[PDB]
Symmetry: C4
């Protein structure tokens, strides 16, 4: 109809209720489910759907051997109905590639997929299900993007890309698209020293992205964007409650403008909702691997370098595998506020469960409640032994 505008503020998050779960690996043990990783959730004005990067093979299929690899000519961004598994028969390909983002602007959807060899990748920006714009690699070192939805405001949908090293400074750019066309792009500015896989959400005409500093930071970099002025800033979450993985143990004081040290060249896509006292951080329970998942209310995490938790909720037990996590919200829901939501990728297979030759995942996702709801833990649920 008309372009959506971020006119609401976030609803108060007093807990998280269950939103969607596809049990993909369980069901896929005996049905035609595509192998995936790097999933997310994204809404249209009339429907919310699960997204991910297919590996172009079923889990039980012999071609599942080797799916631990991240980039191949057989991956594609696919979307499918909420809480269903990604099957060969119900999955809709948005675009071909090994890194992606997607978001609805209120009128139609924009999806971006990057493909190519490491030194010659290119992104093709689709809008209304047609290719419109293409962008060639600028640093010739794995052009890559969000792996979760972008956010739009009055037709302007900013997207964060990174090209260059994963273990040293790289070239991050913020592109501002409108109807699949480039209105403007900036180089990364601010104090964030390395940016990868940003998780974004918007409220009151401002887009907040919680990303990952793969190079040095165990605290997360944050990019805040003004989609009207088409400008941005960057810093790190000040809080001592560190949210990357692997990471060192929590200190008592964090860092606001530098990576918090202790772990180099590694990390996991994550997210956060930074809204003063209504601030919640997501993170794996384990400091060593993508194991477990919890949400922690850390008032003023973004700006208070001594902020510690005041409430929390376990999403996945530390005895269960987790993975990537990101933000999304239904901007077309009724009501006076935007209800914060997120998903957790539940990785199964390699490298942690190597008795199988594949790597895939399932999705669990929650949204906020103003009530103080009881908690449950939500594991993938599959028995690897069955696949043997």
């Amino acid at each position: 109809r008309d372009f959506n505008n971020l006119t609401k503020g976030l609803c108060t998050i007093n807990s998280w209720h269950i939103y969607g779960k596809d049990n993909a690996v369980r069901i896929g043990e005996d049905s035609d489910v595509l192998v995936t990783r790097e999933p997310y959730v994204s809404c249209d004005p009339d429907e919310c759907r699960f997204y991910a990067l297919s590996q172009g093979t079923t889990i039980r299929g012999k071609h599942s051997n080797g799916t631990i690899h991240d980039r191949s000519q057989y991956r594609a961004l696919i979307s499918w109905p909420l809480s269903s598994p990604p099957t060969v028969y119900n999955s809709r390909v948005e675009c071909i590639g090994w890194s992606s983002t997607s978001c609805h602007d209120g009128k139609t959807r924009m999806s971006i997929c990057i493909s190519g060899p490491n030194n010659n990748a290119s992104a093709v920006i689709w809008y209304n299900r047609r290719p419109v714009t293409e962008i060639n690699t600028w640093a010739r070192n794995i052009l890559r993007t969000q792996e979760s939805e972008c956010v739009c405001h009055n037709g302007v949908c900013p997207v964060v890309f990174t090209d260059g090293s994963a273990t040293g400074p790289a070239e991050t750019r913020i592109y501002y698209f409108k109807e699949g066309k480039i209105l403007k792009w900036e180089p990364l500015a601010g104090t964030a020293k390395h940016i990868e896989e940003c998780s974004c959400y918007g409220e009151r005409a401002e887009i907040t992205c919680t990303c990952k500093d793969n190079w040095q930071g165990s605290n997360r970099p944050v990019i805040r964007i003004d989609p009207v002025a088409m400008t941005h800033t960057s810093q790190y979450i000040c809080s001592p409650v560190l949210t990357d993985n692997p990471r060192p143990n929590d200190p008592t004081v964090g860092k606001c403008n530098d990576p918090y040290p202790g772990n180099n060249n590694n990390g996991v896509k994550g997210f956060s909702y930074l809204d003063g006292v209504n601030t919640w951080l997501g993170r794996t329970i384990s400091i060593a691997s993508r194991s477990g998942y919890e949400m922690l209310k850390v008032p003023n995490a973004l700006t208070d370098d001594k902020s510690k938790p005041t409430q929390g909720q376990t999403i996945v037990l530390n005895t269960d595998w987790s993975g990537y996590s990101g933000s999304f919200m239904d901007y077309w829901a009724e009501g006076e506020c935007y209800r914060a939501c997120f998903y957790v990728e539940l990785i199964r297979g390699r490298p942690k469960e190597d008795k199988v030759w594949w790597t895939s995942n399932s999705i669990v996702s929650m949204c906020s409640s103003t009530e103080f709801l009881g908690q449950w833990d939500w594991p993938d649920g599959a028995k690897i032994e069955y696949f043997l």
Copy 2:
């Protein structure tokens, strides 16, 4: 369009004709059919569909082992086209949980799913396919609901929940929702001593629910609701024709305001159509197990404590497995009256057929005819031996 209003009375029930049957277990022996239980049927203004609680695995899948259990993080309310089986590819997830209800108000649908551990469950009420309201467990003992459709009148859709003991008094509440929002809730009132899994239908601005007294009653409790005044009453079906299971043999006089004794802490979801002489009771043929199924015309069953059958119809032979049963009607059908319908869950597998490690079911459903139609029996139809 506009909210539906219960303006018609029930059609005269002179017999029951076949409405839908999915033959899920038969077909699922060699195709991707989800394991389910707790099914029901519910209509939208333009389509009627089968509903049930998936177990998050196919019947032939190895994860089917253990599906006798009622609550896990892998269940979800799914709906699928009428008389089709619940397949991985055609099933639509309404919400995640292990207990549910759902109904269309004329404009859009409201679905409710409860999930959680036993001592910390929570219900999330979805409307127009979006989460709108959440309710935390109030007795910390398996918050649970209908397991069949709710009914709406002018936007108001009452739902019956129970939290607390299954073998002693519990806390039953009647919530009145409008557009997924809580307008009001009452504690159970009346003479019913325990309420679980209510089967409801509406006619002439009144909603009648035939539930189950798991604690002591072999006769069924009945809750009648006025969705305008948003008030209700409760009592038991007076009739000596006892309809729970297991149950003692039929007496010659029943009980109107107390559970009819003889069987404690057990039962099965059931239903009835209470409409003076146009009254029909459904029940298993066996008094010991969920075996067989029949419909009995028992004039004035609700208010006559000596009422006995005047006509009847066998639905399932006593040599075939049955299970839960509930009411639904197509409130958007043409004509001057509402045609009473019901479904019977045909349970296969554990605990009765333990040569297999799973428990699932198929659905058979009928609606009333003003004709006096010949009868057939409708079994599940699957041979367990094939699954061995």
Copy 3:
């Protein structure tokens, strides 16, 4: 929109072109295809679809054992997209039963399914996907109907039913339905001595049905209906070119008002287009079994007792299995005339191919061309050996 009226005459049939073929048995050797028999084709104003009676099991499924039987509680009328196979995932159940008919009146569709034991069957007439009317068996001996589409004119859709003996006189009735409601019914009149499984088509406000005299006739009975006056007549195809099966060899003179003798208590559903010189007869090539299929132009077959062929077209070689055949036309096609179409059921399995324990079929269908097209033969195409 508005009810369709049969205002056109038939197009000149100079040959038959290929219309649809699903290759169901071939494909079903390795995919989830439902076992069927008694198929047909029927159009809506915006789409034409394949129909048949499912057996409630896949072909490869173990429950396929025993599908040679005609009536069970596991059958249902299902429809699916043109030329696709009937799969568990794309098949839409119209109604539950073991004998059926269906037709679109221009506004919406009416489907009829009969179910029950032999001595207590009942038909339930659905309209706009809702049950509207029910008719109980009147002779208590396998109430049965067309097994192909009915035809409508100004909302009136006549249907032919038979109840009683298959090897002696029976009670055939012609029901005239409008919006699923019975406007009137007549007993069979005319000279036809036994009627079963009528194949109908309409043109210029008249409906012609070519049926089967199971009792004594090797020539086909024909019922012509006036859907305005709601009256009909009956006789046999006069032609010596006999079209039932099994049958005696062709004589030089046929019978207009009596069954042509030589074969008792047997036959196959068939059809014809009776339009003066533009008359075409369909029949198996074999006089002994449902083997092969051909179309023969027999000018004035209906009224000329010495009429013999003037042109012809082989549809299926005598070295391939055939089966039932019936008429349908797209009454919503563009142009000045109705293009005659028909389908042939290609039966595979029992009783002829008994190395397998099942019986199913595929569908091949053609429509007329005003050109004189070259011919091909269209077999099922499956190798039974693969199923062993």
Copy 4:
């Protein structure tokens, strides 16, 4: 809405970006994917889809044995969502036959399928999903058509057919259809000596077809059509950069009006975009077999007999199997120009990979970019060993 008119010129082709890829053979190793060959892509005003000729069997199905053969009664033109594989459950049959073409005129789609024995084939032209016209074989020797989309202008959609020898002069005709009806047909004129399987595209009210001279030419014949005057001409691509296969090595001077000699009675469907300096040629890398694939910018290829490459892009490595290739464009995309696109059939199985008894393929397709994008190679991706 209104008939589409070719009012735009082609966009400048500076490179090719990835558009769609279905990975059909990989996925089909463990899922219900139909065996195909002769694929293409074609757009409607609201969606672009993959097309191909099914073999009427799954790849893993036993009936896949023998699919190396080109014509059988089990083939059909099927279409399915872009970048999905052709599965039994998501494939839509357009028409039955072993040679086809299809195109949307802006209002609705016209699809053509030819079926029959070699000496008696016939084409049936469908429009708006209904059969409208039929054309009988005129030379009684494998009536055949494009195997890629046709193009329309103001309701007029020209199609190129060939009937007669594959190794000597044949009878090629250009039919001009409007709403499935024949407006006019011409015999082939110009200097092309043999025409088969034309790949067409339209721009500025002119349709260009790059076909194949199976008899003698290693350079490609080109037919240019004026869909208003309904007239055409023909010649060969002048360029020494030969694009058929097998073929001799490239000379330094080509032929404009005669087949370039060196290879008789063989070839592969191919295409080109002839637009002055904005000219690009597609061809297999190997001169001996359907191996590899590349795009070469050959300015003025059509008219310059010494034209050689000025830029290029590898699509498939010479160490990977390729096959047919053809043109299509989204005539309903936004913007001021038509973006050239093409697909490459990636053949797997027989005759090159004979350890399996089947022959099928997957599809890879690209479209032009005005950017100079980095290149990747796009193989089928399946391991034949897995099918053993």
